[PDB]
Design a protein around this ligand. Structure first.
Ligand SMILES: CC(=O)Nc1cccnc1
Ligand SMILES: CC(=O)Nc1cccnc1
Ligand SMILES: [Cl-]
Length: 147
């Protein structure tokens, strides 16, 4: 039926079916379309006080809660999806990763290099697709598979 990872769901607010991916946390209205040695991704990281290192170039002391970080992530996803903001712009301005300076680009990587939830989401994304919020010990990620 659907590229494994995807399941059907129903909108609580509208009653229309949609599709959700439990590896990427992506959700979308259309039935999804459907692995390489390597993928290339960008990401926007929002850290929180329980992050493995609760500090970043934006903030010496990251004090926001996990819930607050998820609200920020969800806000960025909305603006990216509406076209109000570009992923690259929000990553440059607001990612707590040093990769912010490169518009979030991490370059290419294989399995075994990144944190597992990040890796699994990255490899389950199709080229050009964006994840939903992805949780790791670093914080919460929006992941964009570029290659
Ligand atoms: C890959 C990473 O974690 N950071 C980074 C920093 C600067 C430029 N590109 C990437
Ligand atoms: C492994 C890592 O953190 N990558 C990195 C660091 C600095 C600049 N560019 C990339
Ligand atoms: Cl801010």
């Amino acid at each position: 039926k659907l590229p494994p990872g995807w399941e059907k769901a129903m909108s609580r607010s509208s009653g229309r079916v949609y599709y959700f991916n439990h590896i990427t946390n992506a959700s979308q209205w259309e039935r999804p379309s459907g692995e390489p040695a390597r993928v290339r991704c960008s990401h926007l990281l929002v850290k929180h006080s329980q992050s493995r290192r609760p500090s970043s170039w934006r903030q010496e002391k990251i004090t926001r809660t996990k819930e607050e970080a998820l609200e920020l992530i969800n806000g960025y996803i909305q603006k990216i999806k509406s076209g109000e903001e570009d992923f690259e712009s929000l990553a440059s301005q607001f990612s707590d990763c040093s990769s912010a300076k490169a518009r979030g680009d991490l370059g290419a990587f294989s399995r075994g290099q990144m944190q597992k939830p990040f890796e699994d989401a990255s490899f389950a994304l199709r080229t050009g697709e964006m994840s939903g919020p992805v949780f790791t010990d670093s914080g919460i990620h929006i992941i964009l598979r570029t290659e």
